[PDB]
């Protein structure tokens with residue numbers, strides 16, 4: 128279909144991948160750092176979900192260099208994909224209004 | 229009226245529904261989990277409001293699997309609706325500028 | 330000038346007003362509630378700023394019904410204004426590209 | 431290339447600058463305030479990154495007047511740049527759809 | 532690192548009575564506590580996970596409760612086969628750590 | 638301001654034995670603790686940073702552990718050159734502060 132939809136869908140699929148990879152990689156980077164809490168996979172997936180959406184409750188977060196980098200990748204992927212859905216909707220609404228007018 | 233406005237309005241009404249349902253369902257999922265704080269309806273409605281807007285102070289959050297899922301639904305509904313209002317405004321501004329030009 | 334710019338500017342000015350009013354009103358609503366921390370004006374202005382931007386560190390937040398309502402007004406005003414600037418930029422970029430093409 | 435891309439790219443480069451400057455300036459403003467935690471550069475860079483994205487975990491935040499101001503500058507720069515990328519994408523998608531139609 | 536305190540070190544109960552083992556953490560760890568049973572010359576065996584979740588194959592007699600810093604492992608009506616050492620283990624923060632242990636004596 | 642307590646003030650170990658210095662913070666400071674060695678008439682020397690990170694040029698014998706409020710500096714098999722005063726220092730919150738010190742005696 129139209130490019131924007133292809134870009135929006137693609138940057139959902141990619142986001143889901145980043146959530147799983149970002150969840151597996153955060154546990155890998157954080158174990159070994161005394162005091163770290165992002166160390167088991169289930170809560171790490173929850174952590175990534177609340178990071179990508181930018182809600183960030185503060186119940187869990189990375190304390191190591193690599194865990195933080197992973198965090199930045201998760202943030203950008205989520206923000207980027209949401210900005211791509213908004214842009215795709217605007218295109219659909221704009222192109223659609225050109226008709227109603 | 230124009231599609232975008234119909235979509236923006238609709239994804240306000242839907243959001244208000246998710247806030248109430250998301251508030252009732254979080255209490256249902258969280259009671260029974262030792263240590264949980266999202267267990268009375270008034271503060272749960274406040275919790276959902278700060279989740280949907282993505283502010284997330286960290287004063288309240290789900291610790292169970294289902295409460296978290298509900299949380300993800302509340303997040304997407306809020307983010308989605310805000311992205312639909314921004315897209316509707318852009319359409320109104322764009323279509324409106326085509327005139328001024 | 331063009332509508333969108335008039336709407337973007339207007340929903341900056343309005344935001345600054347909400348930040349000051351939202352800061353004065355939160356102190357009014359929160360004093361009297363045992364345990365409340367949003368009770369002096371300087372930090373309350375900082376609180377509103379981090380709420381409107383949706384960053385929400387969790388260092389300060391309302392615990393009363395009215396303080397929370399004020400919080401919701403501050404959130405919507407900030408999110409709304411940012412969505413109006415993004416929409417205004419898209420209109421300027423779109424209308425501007427129609428030329429380059 | 432097209433204006434929007436020039437504006438999006440520019441408000442990436444500028445953001446990276448604000449992240450480094452905002453990180454150096456927060457340490458400068460916060461040292462001297464008893465209780466402050468935003469006092470070493472590495473974690474301050476992490477702090478700025480989570481502020482600009484609006485995730486705000488609450489693990490670190492400014493307690494002084496100037497550190498907070500810096501925080502507001504970091505917030506606006508991040509939010510502004512993300513709103514400029516979304517607007518640039520919409521322009522690319524919109525202009526691109528005019529073709530497919 | 533989180534210190535898990537198990538006291539008393541030895542517990543004596545009459546056959547059929549209800550016994551309770553205590554585990555205290557040096558800081559709040561939610562419900563991230565797990566219990567193991569180790570009989571003489573045997574390897575540890577998972578009894579209860581996440582403070583109160585049951586494992587399959589484990590007698591219904593065993594139960595756990597608590598959250599935060601205080602945790603309890605309970606046995607409704609103890610019997611001879613329950614004679615062993617009991618250990619708690621937390622997974623809230625790295626590194627995982629074990630309590631010192633409580634011996635069940637009948 | 639964070640108070641760093643170093644106790645005991647003096648430690649006596651036999652040559653080659655394993656010794657451990659303790660540092661307790663008045664509040665949680667993650668792993669933002671650093672250790673220094675100061676010999677008689679000498680200036681302080683960085684031994685371990687961030688609770689457990691090694692510095693180049695420092696004997697492998699030296700190691701550190703801990704997080705939160707409790708920290709330990711360990712020396713596997715002490716020798717004569719280790720006779721000195723030992724100080725911890727935190728950088729979690731302003732202002733930086735030093736523990737009172739422990740003297741190593743053989």
Ligand SMILES: CCCCCCCCCCCCCC(=O)O[C@@H](CO)COC(=O)CCCCCCCC
Nearest residue numbers: 147150151168169170172173176291292293296300
């Ligand atoms: C190696 C790749 C790892 C990728 C991440 C996989 C994580 C594990 C699966 C998730 C949950 C398993 C449940 C469990 O056994 O834990 C529950 C025990 O009470 C509590 O769950 C939790 O409290 C975590 C909730 C996470 C919710 C995430 C919602 C995302 C939309």
Ligand SMILES: CCCCCCCCCCCCCC(=O)O[C@@H](CO)COC(=O)CCCCCCCC
Nearest residue numbers: 248251252269270271273274277392393394397401
């Ligand atoms: C079964 C469906 C449940 C749906 C949710 C219903 C929640 C209950 C109604 C809300 C408040 C009642 C007040 C009360 O008795 O509590 C106050 C006691 O001091 C404090 O209020 C609170 O501190 C909570 C504030 C919540 C503010 C939400 C703002 C949303 C725009």
Ligand SMILES: CCCCCCCCCCCCCC(=O)O[C@@H](CO)COC(=O)CCCCCCCC
Nearest residue numbers: 349352353370371372374375378493494495498502
């Ligand atoms: C009645 C209407 C009230 C409206 C709000 C007015 C608030 C008071 C003025 C603000 C600061 C005064 C400084 C002071 O005496 O406090 C400082 C003492 O160390 C610390 O400041 C603080 O730590 C608060 C910082 C707030 C930063 C806000 C940045 C907004 C862009």
Ligand SMILES: CCCCCCCCCCCCCC(=O)O[C@@H](CO)COC(=O)CCCCCCCC
Nearest residue numbers: 190191192195199450453454471472473475476479
């Ligand atoms: C004067 C200008 C200052 C500008 C900021 C510079 C900050 C210092 C460089 C950053 C890290 C050095 C590592 C180190 O020695 O610290 C590590 C010790 O374990 C832990 O790192 C940390 O835990 C901080 C992680 C920060 C991640 C930021 C990710 C941004 C995409």
Ligand SMILES: [K+]
Nearest residue numbers: 181282383484
């Ligand atoms: K946010």
Ligand SMILES: [K+]
Nearest residue numbers: 182283384485
């Ligand atoms: K946030």
Ligand SMILES: [K+]
Nearest residue numbers: 183284385486
């Ligand atoms: K937050």
Ligand SMILES: [K+]
Nearest residue numbers: 185286387488
């Ligand atoms: K918090």
Ligand SMILES: [K+]
Nearest residue numbers: 185286387488
């Ligand atoms: K928070």
